[PDB]
Design a protein around this nucleic acid. Structure first.
Lengths: 272, 44, 88
RNA sequence: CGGAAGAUCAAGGGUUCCAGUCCAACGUUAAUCGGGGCUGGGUGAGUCGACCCCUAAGGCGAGGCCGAAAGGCGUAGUCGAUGGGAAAUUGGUUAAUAUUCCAAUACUUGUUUAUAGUGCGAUGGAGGGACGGAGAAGGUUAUGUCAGCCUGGCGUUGGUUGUCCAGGUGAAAGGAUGUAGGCUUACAGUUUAGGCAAAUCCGGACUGUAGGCUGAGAUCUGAUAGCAAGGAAGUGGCAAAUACCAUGCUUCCAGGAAAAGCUUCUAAGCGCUAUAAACGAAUCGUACCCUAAACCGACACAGGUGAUCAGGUAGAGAAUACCAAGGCGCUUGAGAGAACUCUGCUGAAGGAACUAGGCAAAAUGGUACCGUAACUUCGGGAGAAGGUACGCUGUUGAUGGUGAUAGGCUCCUUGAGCUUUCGACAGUCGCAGAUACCAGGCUGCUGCAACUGUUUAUUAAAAACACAGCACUCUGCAAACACGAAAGUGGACGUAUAGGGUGUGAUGCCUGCCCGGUGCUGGAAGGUUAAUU
């Protein structure tokens, strides 16, 4: 849940932290860990290609099983861990043969219960099934897009997908983006929504807390000079022009998708 | 106050040194030019 | 080979440190070839001074000094010297 | 001067180090002196560092991809420390080196030979190595101080053979030991959807059977060391680190290198473990400066320059004052004692009348206790404001620690000596007791920005930028977006509770009307309309 801090400092007055007593207090499983150095948002040219990235805490990469190809071998949930690489919690799975993996933890997934992968699996949270074997109207997460590639959609904390129906070899999914789209029925999904549903209820409180997460400050275009940004310039405060990015692309309403090879997968979008 | 030149031997030999010159085609042109002028110091 | 050991020792060192080292500990100081190892110094001493045994060789490289002569700035050669401890 | 202006380094420099000799130039003066000239000397390592083994960021990169050329990228790899990986300490010695030489006592790791036993072998598997921030209670040592002991002294002026004065005096690593702490069930057997193959090793599932590891310090040993006046002492109390136990323990969230060495397991394939004995451990660095006159600043330049060591008395203290060890008086002096300048000290009466403006100065300043308003987001405001005590002497109450001594690497009781913290009462001196140095001035109204932060290096620190928070909008993943000619990247080994762009800027109360213009989104009936034909 969400815990307010007492206003014992002005940097604490608006801290509302997400607290989970039930997640592991110890260190992650060492064999599923990879080193991961920060990038600063710089590509192989050493250029900033993504702004406001830098600093923050050193973190290891947890290797997540997004594919779930250990079918028909049951696993038990050893522990539910915090992951610094995502907003969702992760579950350490312990298979019958003793192999250990990490998966995205579902909300209704506790330590001790048994998870299954494959086509003859119960419709319980954490089980991975092909979309043709999941009853319509089941709330799912961790959606595969290409067959065998692993989950790409509905992975963030609290993420759920409505499985609306079917047309041929396609499952019709309503995503939390307000988007109805086709996915091949041989692609897999995991039952239930994703854990850490109150991720979006948190309040960082102070600028240093955003710095701890590797985010550098953001400087509005209107505060620049015209040589830096289309919004720069002016005696005093002034906008003057249609809002746009520093590269001159409009930022209020202009659509930017340009992908014809996937355009047939998309039923529709919602209007609000 | 702190001045512009803060010497470091490794940094000098790694940005301006002989092998650094010979690693580039443009550094080899630096060397060819220094040899054509007849400089007694090719590289730092 | 026995022709490389003849070039190892370039000559003795005559100084106050050398003199008192010889008096107190019976240790000989040589200017040695710039490329000689302790094993080579040991073998060369034991071959060119028949009847002596070498306990210890201590080596050191000494950088040559800059001595501006006339209009030019030049420098002396570096050299290597060995402290050789002999059986009493 | 002395948390350096002493000492040890790294970086950088390179002989400046030491001796002799010289004084033209150099040195802001002179110089017999010097970091100056000249001539000689000086740097000693299996253990310190480098090299070496290993990898981080990041490079380079057989093949590979891409690109007019040049080239760009990238796999395997190969490099790359600022990080991981073996090992010694005390004392003496030089004009100048010393964990290097010498003495004593250690430690690490190899090769060869031999004796036995005997399945060995990896770039691969598994363990290990191996790690965050904060906080807290202890236990210690370094070290200090007093005492004891030893050696000297009887004081130019009252006293000073004593409860007097001064100086000296405390051996390490290592080996044993296994303490205060810390962690912790152990062994055997059966088997196997796992560890890319294999595995007796790990993991998993079962069946029986029920103190160990680590660890500062103390103690013993090392230990008949060394050390002064001309051949001495060398052991007790107390205090006490930011060092050590401790890579520990407890908590938190922002979730905390890698790889090798090392221990085991097997694969292809065909040496290893103990006991010693002898022999070895290469190469490079080592002088000297290093809060500086030796580095970076054109200078022997008031600047800058990372780490380490950290004595005494006061003191919370690494502040401050005065001192120790050690090191210096800062390379022009001598007079005079005008104006004026600078930096200070004191100032009658008045007390902001000064001035753009209390600028500058003056003032306040410690601890304990009492007391403290509006307002408030209930945290605060607040050290609000404002008061009172405070030295020394004697007596006296309580109290923490440590433990001699007795009684039953341990326990309990008792408590000598030493030391901690609060008080009370009585006296006493001065103008003054937080006496020096040190060390908040404080209130009322009001604009701005929520706040901590950031910024015009070198005339602007702010009301500017950022900020947590809010909203709009884009983006379904080969995402949007950005770098790039492309390949290849970042976004992200992320996935709409996410990521980008834009505005606004905590919070409270809130956020009206206008879609004509220009954008954006959707629509396509009609008009117009390219190449082409």
């Amino acid at each position: 849940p969400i815990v307010k801090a007492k206003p014992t400092s002005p940097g604490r007055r608006f801290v509302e932290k997400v607290v989970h007593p039930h997640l592991y207090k110890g260190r992650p499983f060492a064999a599923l860990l990879e080193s991961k150095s920060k990038t600063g948002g710089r590509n192989n040219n050493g250029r900033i290609t993504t702004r406001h990235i830098g600093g923050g805490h050193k973190q290891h990469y947890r290797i997540i099983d997004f594919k779930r190809t250990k079918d028909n071998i049951p696993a038990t949930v050893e522990r539910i861990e915090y992951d610094p690489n995502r907003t969702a919690h992760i579950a350490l799975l312990k298979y019958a043969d003793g192999e250990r993996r990490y998966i995205i933890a579902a909300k209704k997934q506790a330590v001790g219960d048994t998870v299954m992968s494959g086509e003859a699996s119960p419709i319980r949270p954490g089980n991975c099934l092909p979309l043709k074997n999941i009853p319509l109207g089941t709330v799912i997460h961790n959606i595969e897009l290409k067959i065998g590639k692993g989950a790409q959609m509905a992975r963030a904390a609290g993420a759920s997908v409505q499985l609306l129906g079917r047309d041929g070899i396609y499952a019709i999914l309503r995503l939390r983006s307000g988007e109805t789209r086709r996915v091949h029925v041989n692609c897999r999904a995991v039952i239930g929504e994703v854990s850490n549903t109150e991720n979006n209820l948190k309040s960082l409180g102070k600028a240093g807390a955003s710095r701890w997460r590797g985010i550098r400050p953001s400087v509005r275009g209107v505060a620049m000079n015209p040589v830096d940004h289309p919004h720069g310039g002016g005696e005093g405060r002034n906008k003057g022009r249609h809002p746009t990015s520093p590269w001159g692309q409009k930022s209020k309403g202009l659509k930017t998708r340009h992908n014809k090879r996937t355009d047939s997968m998309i039923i529709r979008r919602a209007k609000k | 106050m702190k001045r512009t030149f803060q010497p470091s031997v490794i940094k000098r030999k790694r940005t301006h040194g002989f092998r650094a010159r010979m690693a580039t085609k443009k550094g080899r042109q630096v060397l060819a030019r220094r040899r054509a002028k007849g400089r007694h110091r090719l590289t730092v | 080979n026995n022709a490389r050991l003849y070039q190892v020792l370039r000559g003795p060192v005559f100084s106050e440190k050398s003199q008192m080292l010889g008096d107190s500990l019976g240790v000989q100081v040589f200017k040695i070839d710039s490329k000689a190892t302790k094993l080579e110094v040991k073998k060369a001493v034991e071959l060119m001074f028949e009847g002596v045994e070498v306990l210890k060789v201590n080596t050191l490289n000494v950088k040559g000094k800059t001595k501006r002569f006339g209009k030019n700035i030049g420098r002396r050669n570096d050299y290597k010297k060995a402290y050789v401890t002999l059986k009493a």
